[PDB]
Design an enzyme around this catalytic site. Structure first.
Site, PDB file in Angstrom:
ATOM      1  N   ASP A   1      -5.159  10.386 -10.715  1.00 52.05           N
ATOM      2  CA  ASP A   1      -4.103  11.656 -11.184  1.00 52.05           C
ATOM      3  C   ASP A   1      -4.914  12.252 -12.218  1.00 52.05           C
ATOM      4  OD1 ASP A   1      -1.881  10.314  -9.681  1.00 52.05           O
ATOM      5  OD2 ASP A   1      -2.344   8.633 -11.297  1.00 52.05           O
TER       6      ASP A   1
ATOM      7  N   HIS B   1      -5.346   2.440  -5.534  1.00 54.66           N
ATOM      8  CA  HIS B   1      -4.080   3.299  -6.210  1.00 54.66           C
ATOM      9  C   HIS B   1      -4.390   3.339  -7.817  1.00 54.66           C
ATOM     10  CE1 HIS B   1      -0.023   4.616  -7.957  1.00 54.66           C
ATOM     11  NE2 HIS B   1      -0.340   5.500  -6.844  1.00 54.66           N
TER      12      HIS B   1
ATOM     13  N   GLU C   1      -4.552  13.928  -7.389  1.00 54.85           N
ATOM     14  CA  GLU C   1      -3.390  14.386  -7.403  1.00 54.85           C
ATOM     15  C   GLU C   1      -3.106  15.331  -8.789  1.00 54.85           C
ATOM     16  OE1 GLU C   1       1.437  13.359  -7.411  1.00 54.85           O
ATOM     17  OE2 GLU C   1       0.101  11.813  -6.989  1.00 54.85           O
TER      18      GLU C   1
ATOM     19  N   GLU D   1      -8.116   6.676  -5.499  1.00 58.70           N
ATOM     20  CA  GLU D   1      -7.033   7.688  -5.642  1.00 58.70           C
ATOM     21  C   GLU D   1      -6.552   7.736  -7.281  1.00 58.70           C
ATOM     22  OE1 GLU D   1      -3.786   7.021  -7.128  1.00 58.70           O
ATOM     23  OE2 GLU D   1      -3.242   9.289  -6.791  1.00 58.70           O
TER      24      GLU D   1
ATOM     25  N   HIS E   1      -2.042   9.282 -15.325  1.00 59.12           N
ATOM     26  CA  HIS E   1      -0.800   9.721 -14.696  1.00 59.12           C
ATOM     27  C   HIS E   1       0.350  10.382 -15.360  1.00 59.12           C
ATOM     28  CE1 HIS E   1       3.055   8.914 -12.555  1.00 59.12           C
ATOM     29  NE2 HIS E   1       2.401   8.543 -11.486  1.00 59.12           N
TER      30      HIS E   1
END
Length: 306
Positions: free
Chosen positions: A48, A19, A148, A46, A61
């Site tokens: 962002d 993450h 994301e 993962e 993020h």
């Protein structure tokens, strides 16, 4: 004859998908965190994405640089050159992601980026900056990535749509399709999927809610449901819900991020509930768990926890 739909992500298990790199073991969303995580055993990253004033996708993020760096302001207001000079480990504290306002001794990697501390061996100062997505793709050619789409504020829908448009353009030139793209905002997912129909996607909020509550299947192109452990006091990553999602041909990926503890008891329960990947804040810890139980992994058969 209708194209037979067979979903390869149903055999890509169990996945350790760090993450943001593992925000409790390394500074989040940095090349250092990513490289560290893959060497320690992460199958997938993962990350962002936001966009700079000059329309570069960067890996961060929040909408502002304030929490994770020595700077201030929004990403959309800063050029890539202003963003990249910042120290992206400025506020990093092991076990606690990024916490501003503590004594300088709290921060073991503050200053590596700007040259005041020596980097860990085999890394460079730039590994501790905010990276271009393009540089993460270039650094990880044979590693899958979950991306994301972020925005400026919950109410600023165009900024999601702007980022989705840039993301599709950049992903399309790579020729790769070993990504899953998603967003909390449902429209941005549909816009990405329009511009880049070959990249696998996971649904946003209304898509998750519709499927979880009403059984309404997600948008065409979905290969997985990406879920928290709990949402609004309700448990989502249950064995029942995952068994139904597999029956419908979707894989399931579970994240934590405050909706449940990032610890060994929780990791073990989600593994036990048949999820195809976890997104740990402690990727080395999850890797120790997967190894000692000998859980099956992509290309390495083993124990099925089901």
């Amino acid at each position: 004859t209708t194209r037979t739909t067979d979903n390869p992500w149903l055999d890509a298990r169990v996945l350790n998908m760090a993450h943001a790199g593992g925000e409790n073991e390394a500074p989040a969303n940095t090349l250092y965190a990513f490289k560290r995580a893959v060497k320690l055993g992460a199958n997938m990253l993962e990350l962002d994405v936001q966009s700079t004033k000059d329309d570069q996708l960067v890996v961060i993020h929040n909408a502002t640089v304030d929490q994770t760096t020595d700077g201030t302001g929004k990403v959309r207001d800063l050029t890539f050159e202003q963003v990249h000079e910042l120290d992206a480990a400025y506020n990093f504290i092991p076990g606690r992601h990024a916490v501003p306002g503590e004594p300088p001794e709290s921060y073991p990697l503050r200053g590596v980026r700007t040259g005041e501390k020596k980097p860990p061996p085999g890394y460079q100062p730039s590994d501790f900056a905010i990276p271009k997505l393009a540089d993460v793709l270039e650094a990880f050619p044979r590693t899958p990535i979950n991306i994301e789409i972020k925005g400026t504020s919950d109410a600023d829908i165009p900024s999601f749509l702007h980022n989705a448009k840039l993301l599709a353009r950049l992903l399309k030139k790579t020729g790769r399709t070993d990504f899953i793209v998603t967003s909390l905002n449902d429209l941005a997912v549909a816009k990405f999927h329009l511009l880049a129909p070959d990249i696998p996607i996971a649904p946003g909020m209304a898509g998750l809610a519709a499927y979880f509550l009403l059984g309404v299947k997600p948008m065409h192109g979905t290969v997985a449901l990406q879920i928290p452990v709990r949402y609004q006091g309700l448990e989502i990553a249950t064995p029942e819900f995952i068994r139904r999602a597999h029956a419908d041909g979707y894989a399931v990926h579970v994240w934590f991020s405050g909706t449940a503890p990032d610890d060994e008891a929780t990791y073990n329960r989600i593994i036990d509930s048949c999820a195809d990947g976890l997104m740990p804040a402690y990727p080395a810890l999850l890797e120790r768990i997967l190894d000692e139980r000998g859980i099956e992994r992509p290309g390495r058969p083993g124990v099925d926890p089901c």
